[PDB]
Write a protein that binds this DNA or RNA. Structure first.
Ligand code: HPA
Ligand code: HPA
Lengths: 340, 340
DNA sequence: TACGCAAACGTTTGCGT
DNA sequence: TACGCAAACGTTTGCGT
């Protein structure tokens, strides 16, 4: 049915129907009842399409993600969605896989559907990507995963990935290790280069040099972890500890080690990053830096609703903070006792 | 801008603008150009909201999931979304967590947003849930995870979870085991009771009795797996092999074993179910039954588009098929050599 | 005091000529 | 031959009385 149908069945104006449906003005009880009565028999469902046409807002948010399968991403997504729901919003999920065109498409479809705001999680931000985004400065949006603020027309949440890298390297140091290797994620990403550099700073501070044979690039996918660990323990001289850029990648590293008969951490200590929900059940239970995923979603959604409801103009940035989680994959290194 | 704005800037009727924008009728080149010209300066973005008002379709599909974090679910979701995209559709993701009210809410918001169709993945289907769903028989929909066809007004894709349980138990049998334990998922779910029963049939066939001290209920969450494995290997008499209802749960089982110093599979063979993307990197690499996740999404989306575009009336059902993946978590059991 | 009329949001399309 | 007019989709709201 349409509002007209209900109005006729209730013997009232459509204006009236709309008023009871939205509590936008006082309506006599008996009137209000009859309308409800009508609303029910006809089995009426107001049309958000029509409403949005008038009121100029869809109560829809669009997430332009990289992928949603990856544990990391998946945890954030579910976080963002929880908040949309409690605040009445509907989520439009779009994965662009780091593909420009795909991005151009989703962006477009999004604007056409008139999303009240946009949450961007694209991992890498090449100029061209930045370009398109700007062409959409009119839609309120927050990038949730870049280093600093890439754009000047968007809100940003900073993860402090660097102080996260440092924390990791420090722990290793403080545990007795000085022969460390690293499997960073894509250098083109914040959680990639960011973590790595935080980590290398700690190293330079300790005068630890990390030989390039010990730095093998990952892609956040287990296979890459698996493969890198292999290249690392396949060398004559091999590290006593390893900083792995992402948990899922580390899970790959564990496997390879186990397959070459190495023991974690008795033979090689491994420390990861993300603290994904299952990291604790890795074998052995993984020690890693925790990315505050939930608050990362809630924070982003909140900066968005702000710009939305309170029509904020100026771009804001909110920092979030990673913290070390000790588990059972790191063991004392050769220099523990000799440490001042 | 609005179409009116572009029309004026192009010195043409809005009808004309709409025709070039939609290639719905021949328009002179020079005309077509000018319109585009206009379309670009004003930076115009057609309004899907307005369009849908007229044409009566939103080109939106709504996924009413249980949760989207869980590896299993997450893999399916990303599958469904890939298909929506290539076919032009937009995805509205809604997690209801098995909460009736939450379900009632999302359903409602969905109908209001006038989704062209609904994809339901609610895990458990209590009567009340069934009730609400029926009240929405008008929206085309397919349940992707039930046993048989729960409703007569919806399409269904059947996973054959039972022949999956059987396959698992058979393998165990054929490997030499006769002392098997099981950690099924929620009995209230298809992938729960279904898998279990497929499995028990195989057992009855071999005259293997599974003592209740050896059946510990899981919930598809690693912790539950962890806890159950513990209760299983904490008994005086303990099984030589274990069928674990879901991979993620099994990952928990592996951990516990490892923690009690047991060896997999030298001490206990473990077989899982789902074949989630990282199962191969479990330690040791997990042997399990593969749920065809991708085709499960694509199949569902396709039955949906059917009812949609081809206005199909009668409810269809398409079966999909699980298949055993051998890895390194199962070892020959005491009766291999004695097997006829 | 409680309610209704008519315009309006941005499009598509019928039926012109 | 190529194009325009006006109605219409389902609502909200201003300004009545
Ligand atoms: O880009 C990423 N992908 C997957 N997991 C991650 N964790 C941090 N960054 C990433
Ligand atoms: O309900 C479920 N939850 C998580 N993983 C699963 N794999 C099969 N069924 C399920």
């Amino acid at each position: 049915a349409t509002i007209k149908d209900v109005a006729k069945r209730a013997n009232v104006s459509t204006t009236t129907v709309s008023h009871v449906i939205n509590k936008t003005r006082f309506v006599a009880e008996e009137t209000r009842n009859a309308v409800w009565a009508a609303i029910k028999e006809l089995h009426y469902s107001p049309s958000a399409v029509a409403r949005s046409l008038k009121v100029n807002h869809t109560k829809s948010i669009g997430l332009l993600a990289t992928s949603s399968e990856a544990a990391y991403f998946a945890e954030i997504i579910e976080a963002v969605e929880k908040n949309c729901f409690q605040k009445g919003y509907t989520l439009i999920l779009g994965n662009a896989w780091n593909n420009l065109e795909k991005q151009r498409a989703y962006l477009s479809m999004m604007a056409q559907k008139r999303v009240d705001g946009l949450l961007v999680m694209c991992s890498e931000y090449p100029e061209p990507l930045l370009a398109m985004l700007e062409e959409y400065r009119h839609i309120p949006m927050v990038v949730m995963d870049a280093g600093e603020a890439k754009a000047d027309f968007t809100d940003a949440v900073i993860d402090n990935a660097f102080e996260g890298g440092y924390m990791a390297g420090r722990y290793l140091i403080e545990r007795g290790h000085r022969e460390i290797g690293v499997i960073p994620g894509p250098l083109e990403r914040n959680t990639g280069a960011g973590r790595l550099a935080g980590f290398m700073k700690a190293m330079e501070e300790a005068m630890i040099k990390v030989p390039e044979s010990w730095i093998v690039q990952g892609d956040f996918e287990p296979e890459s972890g698996y493969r890198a660990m292999q290249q690392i323990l396949s060398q004559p001289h091999r590290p006593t500890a390893v900083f792995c850029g992402g948990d899922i990648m580390a899970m790959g590293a564990l496997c390879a080690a186990d397959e070459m008969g190495l023991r974690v951490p008795q033979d090689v200590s491994l420390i990861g990053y993300d603290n994904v929900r299952n990291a604790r059940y890795f074998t052995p239970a993984l020690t890693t830096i925790h990315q505050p995923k939930d608050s990362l979603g809630e924070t982003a959604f909140n900066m968005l609703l702000d710009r939305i409801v309170n029509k904020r103009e100026e771009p804001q940035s909110i920092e979030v903070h990673p913290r070390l989680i000790e588990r059972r994959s790191v063991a004392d290194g050769p220099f523990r006792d000799y440490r001042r």
